[PDB]
Amino acid sequence: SLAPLREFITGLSALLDEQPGEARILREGGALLARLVARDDWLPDAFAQPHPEYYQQMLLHCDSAERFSIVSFVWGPGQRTPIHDHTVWGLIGMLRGAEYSQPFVLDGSGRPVLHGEPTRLEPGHVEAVSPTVGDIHRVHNAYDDRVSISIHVYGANIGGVRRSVYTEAGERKPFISGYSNPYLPNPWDRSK
Protein backbone atom coordinates (compact mmCIF):
# COMPACT_ATOMS: atom_id res chain seq x y z
CA SER A 1 0.00 0.00 0.00
CA LEU A 2 2.91 2.30 0.81
CA ALA A 3 4.88 0.09 -1.56
CA PRO A 4 4.83 2.69 -4.39
CA LEU A 5 6.52 5.12 -2.04
CA ARG A 6 9.15 2.51 -1.10
CA GLU A 7 9.69 1.70 -4.76
CA PHE A 8 10.19 5.35 -5.54
CA ILE A 9 12.74 5.80 -2.71
CA THR A 10 14.79 2.77 -3.71
CA GLY A 11 14.48 3.51 -7.44
CA LEU A 12 15.68 7.07 -6.97
CA SER A 13 18.45 5.90 -4.67
CA ALA A 14 19.63 3.50 -7.39
CA LEU A 15 19.60 6.28 -9.95
CA LEU A 16 21.63 8.63 -7.73
CA ASP A 17 24.07 5.80 -6.94
CA GLU A 18 25.22 6.20 -10.58
CA GLN A 19 26.34 9.79 -9.86
CA PRO A 20 24.24 11.16 -12.74
CA GLY A 21 24.39 14.73 -14.04
CA GLU A 22 21.44 16.97 -13.14
CA ALA A 23 19.86 16.71 -16.59
CA ARG A 24 19.55 12.94 -16.21
CA ILE A 25 18.35 13.26 -12.62
CA LEU A 26 15.55 15.56 -13.73
CA ARG A 27 14.51 13.36 -16.69
CA GLU A 28 14.89 9.86 -15.25
CA GLY A 29 13.94 11.07 -11.75
CA GLY A 30 10.98 12.79 -13.38
CA ALA A 31 9.80 9.47 -14.85
CA LEU A 32 10.20 7.78 -11.45
CA LEU A 33 8.11 10.45 -9.78
CA ALA A 34 5.47 10.41 -12.53
CA ARG A 35 5.10 6.67 -11.86
CA LEU A 36 4.56 7.40 -8.18
CA VAL A 37 1.96 10.13 -8.75
CA ALA A 38 0.24 8.31 -11.65
CA ARG A 39 -1.97 6.41 -9.21
CA ASP A 40 -3.39 8.02 -6.11
CA ASP A 41 -3.63 4.91 -3.94
CA TRP A 42 -0.68 5.20 -1.53
CA LEU A 43 -0.66 8.56 0.28
CA PRO A 44 -2.14 8.09 3.77
CA ASP A 45 -4.81 10.63 4.77
CA ALA A 46 -2.63 11.89 7.62
CA PHE A 47 -0.22 13.35 5.05
CA ALA A 48 -2.99 14.98 3.00
CA GLN A 49 -4.65 17.19 5.59
CA PRO A 50 -4.70 20.93 4.86
CA HIS A 51 -4.07 23.69 7.39
CA PRO A 52 -6.57 26.58 7.44
CA GLU A 53 -3.89 29.30 7.13
CA TYR A 54 -0.70 27.75 5.74
CA TYR A 55 0.11 25.22 3.05
CA GLN A 56 1.61 22.10 4.67
CA GLN A 57 5.05 20.66 3.85
CA MET A 58 5.14 17.15 5.28
CA LEU A 59 8.39 15.24 5.07
CA LEU A 60 7.78 11.69 3.82
CA HIS A 61 11.43 10.53 3.61
CA CYS A 62 14.96 11.90 3.89
CA ASP A 63 18.01 10.13 2.47
CA SER A 64 20.69 9.36 5.10
CA ALA A 65 23.36 10.91 2.87
CA GLU A 66 20.97 13.85 2.18
CA ARG A 67 21.07 13.23 -1.56
CA PHE A 68 17.32 13.81 -1.60
CA SER A 69 14.18 14.38 0.42
CA ILE A 70 10.51 13.77 -0.40
CA VAL A 71 7.70 16.02 0.79
CA SER A 72 3.90 15.99 0.54
CA PHE A 73 2.78 19.55 -0.25
CA VAL A 74 -0.84 19.98 0.79
CA TRP A 75 -2.61 23.00 -0.72
CA GLY A 76 -5.66 24.23 1.12
CA PRO A 77 -8.23 25.98 -1.10
CA GLY A 78 -6.69 29.00 -2.83
CA GLN A 79 -3.34 28.74 -1.04
CA ARG A 80 -0.12 30.03 -2.60
CA THR A 81 3.61 30.29 -1.93
CA PRO A 82 5.66 33.45 -1.81
CA ILE A 83 8.18 33.89 -4.60
CA HIS A 84 11.19 31.78 -3.66
CA ASP A 85 14.14 29.79 -4.98
CA HIS A 86 15.52 26.34 -4.12
CA THR A 87 19.33 26.36 -4.75
CA VAL A 88 19.20 22.61 -5.49
CA TRP A 89 17.34 20.53 -8.06
CA GLY A 90 13.69 19.82 -7.48
CA LEU A 91 10.89 17.76 -9.00
CA ILE A 92 7.21 18.41 -8.41
CA GLY A 93 4.69 15.68 -9.17
CA MET A 94 1.00 16.48 -9.13
CA LEU A 95 -1.06 13.97 -7.17
CA ARG A 96 -4.45 15.59 -6.55
CA GLY A 97 -6.10 18.67 -7.98
CA ALA A 98 -3.78 21.04 -9.83
CA GLU A 99 -1.42 23.97 -9.34
CA TYR A 100 -0.10 26.91 -11.35
CA SER A 101 3.59 27.75 -11.33
CA GLN A 102 4.80 31.21 -12.36
CA PRO A 103 8.49 31.67 -13.19
CA PHE A 104 10.36 34.78 -12.08
CA VAL A 105 13.80 36.07 -12.96
CA LEU A 106 15.81 38.71 -11.13
CA ASP A 107 16.23 42.14 -12.70
CA GLY A 108 19.23 44.45 -12.59
CA SER A 109 18.97 45.23 -8.87
CA GLY A 110 18.00 41.72 -7.81
CA ARG A 111 14.23 42.07 -7.69
CA PRO A 112 11.94 39.34 -9.04
CA VAL A 113 10.07 40.07 -12.29
CA LEU A 114 7.51 37.94 -14.13
CA HIS A 115 8.99 35.67 -16.73
CA GLY A 116 6.60 34.05 -19.18
CA GLU A 117 3.16 32.55 -18.77
CA PRO A 118 2.36 30.35 -15.78
CA THR A 119 2.02 26.60 -16.34
CA ARG A 120 -0.76 24.38 -15.00
CA LEU A 121 0.42 21.07 -13.53
CA GLU A 122 -2.07 18.20 -13.81
CA PRO A 123 -2.22 14.92 -11.85
CA GLY A 124 0.41 12.48 -13.03
CA HIS A 125 2.63 15.22 -14.48
CA VAL A 126 6.01 16.43 -13.24
CA GLU A 127 7.91 19.72 -13.47
CA ALA A 128 11.51 20.61 -12.55
CA VAL A 129 13.25 23.50 -10.86
CA SER A 130 16.97 24.15 -10.36
CA PRO A 131 19.65 26.87 -10.45
CA THR A 132 20.36 25.57 -13.95
CA VAL A 133 16.90 25.18 -15.48
CA GLY A 134 15.03 27.97 -13.67
CA ASP A 135 14.96 28.22 -9.89
CA ILE A 136 12.63 31.05 -8.92
CA HIS A 137 8.88 30.67 -8.91
CA ARG A 138 5.55 31.14 -7.20
CA VAL A 139 3.08 28.25 -6.96
CA HIS A 140 -0.60 28.31 -6.11
CA ASN A 141 -3.51 25.96 -5.84
CA ALA A 142 -5.39 25.97 -9.15
CA TYR A 143 -8.59 25.65 -7.11
CA ASP A 144 -10.13 28.12 -4.67
CA ASP A 145 -12.55 25.45 -3.43
CA ARG A 146 -10.69 22.21 -2.86
CA VAL A 147 -7.48 20.63 -1.69
CA SER A 148 -4.63 19.93 -4.11
CA ILE A 149 -1.58 17.82 -3.36
CA SER A 150 1.80 17.60 -5.01
CA ILE A 151 4.79 15.38 -4.08
CA HIS A 152 8.08 17.24 -4.13
CA VAL A 153 11.54 15.68 -4.39
CA TYR A 154 14.61 17.86 -3.77
CA GLY A 155 18.35 17.25 -4.15
CA ALA A 156 18.95 17.86 -0.40
CA ASN A 157 17.16 17.79 2.97
CA ILE A 158 14.92 20.67 1.81
CA GLY A 159 13.83 21.54 5.34
CA GLY A 160 17.46 22.38 6.07
CA VAL A 161 18.47 24.30 2.92
CA ARG A 162 19.35 27.96 3.38
CA ARG A 163 17.68 29.67 0.45
CA SER A 164 15.69 32.80 -0.43
CA VAL A 165 12.15 34.05 -0.23
CA TYR A 166 10.91 37.41 -1.55
CA THR A 167 8.79 39.86 0.38
CA GLU A 168 5.60 41.26 -1.09
CA ALA A 169 7.46 44.50 -2.08
CA GLY A 170 10.17 42.36 -3.75
CA GLU A 171 13.04 42.30 -1.23
CA ARG A 172 15.17 39.15 -0.78
CA LYS A 173 15.18 37.43 2.63
CA PRO A 174 16.99 34.34 3.92
CA PHE A 175 14.69 31.38 4.23
CA ILE A 176 14.76 27.81 5.68
CA SER A 177 11.42 26.06 5.16
CA GLY A 178 11.36 23.35 7.85
CA TYR A 179 8.56 20.73 8.09
CA SER A 180 4.98 20.58 9.44
CA ASN A 181 5.08 17.01 10.69
CA PRO A 182 6.60 15.30 13.73
CA TYR A 183 5.92 11.89 12.16
CA LEU A 184 6.95 10.26 8.91
CA PRO A 185 5.18 7.26 7.36
CA ASN A 186 6.65 3.73 7.53
CA PRO A 187 6.98 2.19 4.02
CA TRP A 188 9.59 -0.34 5.13
CA ASP A 189 7.63 -3.27 6.64
CA ARG A 190 8.06 -6.14 4.14
CA SER A 191 6.83 -8.82 6.56
CA LYS A 192 3.52 -9.00 4.69
Binding residues for Fe cation: 84, 86, 137
- Known binding-site residue numbers: 84, 86, 137
Annotated binding site for Fe(3+): 84, 86, 137
- One DSSP character per residue, the chain reads --HHHHHHHHHHHHHHHT---HHHHHHHHHHHHHHHHTS-SS--GGGS---SSS-EEEEEEE-TT-S-EEEEEEEPTT-BPPSB--SS-EEEEEEES-EEEEEEEE-TTS-EEE-S--EEEPTT-EEEEBTTTB--EEEEES-SSS-EEEEEEESS-GGG--EEEE-TTS-EEEE----S-S----------
- Using alpha carbons, list the distances in angstroms from residue 70 to 88, 108, 158, 192: 13, 34, 8, 24
Chain centroid, CA 69 distance in Å: 9
Which residue, among 73, 77, 133, has the nearest Cα to 103 in the 3D structure? 133
